[PDB]
Amino acid sequence: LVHVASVEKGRSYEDFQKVYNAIALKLREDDEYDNYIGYGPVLVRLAWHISGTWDKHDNTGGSYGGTYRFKKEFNDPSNAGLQNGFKFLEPIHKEFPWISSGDLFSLGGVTAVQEMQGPKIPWRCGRVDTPEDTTPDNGRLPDADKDAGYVRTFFQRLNMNDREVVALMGAHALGKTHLKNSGYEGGGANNVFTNEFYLNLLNEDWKLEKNDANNEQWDSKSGYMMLPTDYSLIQDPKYLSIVKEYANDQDKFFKDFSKAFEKLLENGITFPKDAPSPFIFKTLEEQGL
Ligand code: HEM
Numbered sequence: 001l002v003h004v005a006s007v008e009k010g011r012s013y014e015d016f017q018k019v020y021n022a023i024a025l026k027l028r029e030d031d032e033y034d035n036y037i038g039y040g041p042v043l044v045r046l047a048w049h050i051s052g053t054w055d056k057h058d059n060t061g062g063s064y065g066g067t068y069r070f071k072k073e074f075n076d077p078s079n080a081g082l083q084n085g086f087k088f089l090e091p092i093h094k095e096f097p098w099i100s101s102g103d104l105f106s107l108g109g110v111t112a113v114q115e116m117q118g119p120k121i122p123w124r125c126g127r128v129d130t131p132e133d134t135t136p137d138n139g140r141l142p143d144a145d146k147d148a149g150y151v152r153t154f155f156q157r158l159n160m161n162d163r164e165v166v167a168l169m170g171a172h173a174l175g176k177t178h179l180k181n182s183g184y185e186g187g188g189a190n191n192v193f194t195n196e197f198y199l200n201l202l203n204e205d206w207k208l209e210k211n212d213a214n215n216e217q218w219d220s221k222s223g224y225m226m227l228p229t230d231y232s233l234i235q236d237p238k239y240l241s242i243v244k245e246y247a248n249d250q251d252k253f254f255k256d257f258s259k260a261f262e263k264l265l266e267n268g269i270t271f272p273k274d275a276p277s278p279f280i281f282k283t284l285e286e287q288g289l
């Protein structure tokens with residue numbers, strides 16, 4: 001199964017920078033969302049969930065086809081709460097109707113990471129909307145009540161190795177869990193992209209507790225939480241080494257996360273040899289906007 005990137009007709013870097021800027025301005029404007037976290041974290045989660053359906057064995061799922069727009073995927077219990085990110089992007093899509101849905105959902109994650117002071121994430125255009133029958137079934141996204149061996153095996157289907165897994169999980173510094181969405185609660189209100197997930201894993205005094213949904217999660221008195229799959233990264237000795245590496249090297253984490261997150265958003269896509277090079281968008285702050 002081959003998905004060839006096809007640039008939206010006549011469009012170039014400046015077109016996509018305009019889309020980036022509209023998302024970034026809206027992120028700034030809609031500050032109240034989720035107790036003043038803003039939409040950044042949910043947009044990162046959205047970009048990950050639309051990509052994380054991918055199966056390297058047959059190239060089903062993945063970001064290319066924009067299939068999150070269809071009810072079967074929109075309504076995946078694993079996607080509960082992402083409707084907020086979709087609604088945020090609706091007016092952006094109306095302003096720029098020429099962008100494909102996969103391009104918009106993935107660009108929303110890039111824009112969110114960068115506007116939250118994260119690394120630059122190079123981004124390529126050319127995902128093309130595919131039909132409703134190409135929507136992957138529910139159940140391809142990961143469970144949170146699982147150990148390190150589950151995490152490791154799960155991510156092999158996305159062609160991610162231990163370093164890529166631990167780097168990607170650093171996005172869990174952002175935002176929070178919501179009981180009604182996932183059966184987990186808490187995490188704070190962070191909307192700045194840092195390596196603090198790793199520092200918190202190593203430095204907080206974690207207690208294994210049951211939440212109001214009767215699920216176990218790790219809580220600290222300082223008010224952080226870790227999912228069982230987050231805490232697995234310090235239970236497994238191979239993951240632990242990499243956690244320590246990122247807790248001690250902000251720049252290395254940024255570089256590794258940027259590579260892994262681009263790769264995640266591009267899995268499944270064939271880029272022609274004469275496709276444009278990846279775009280690196282300027283933040284609003286870099287543009288004086
Ligand atoms: C084993 C893998 C993972 C599991 C089990 C997992 C699970 C979860 C769960 C249960 C939530 C809370 C959803 C809610 O209640 O609203 C969440 C939130 C989030 N996840 Fe993950 N996740 C995983 C990997 C990732 C990755 C790879 C990324 C992106 C690189 C990511 C980014 C986020 C973000 C940013 C949020 C916060 C959303 C918000 O504040 O609304 N997650 N994740």
Ligand SMILES: Nc1c([N+](=O)[O-])cnc2ccccc12
Nearest residue numbers: 172175176177187224225226
């Ligand atoms: N804030 C978070 C933390 N945290 O360390 O506060 C840990 N795990 C999370 C998983 C999903 C969303 C937010 C998380």
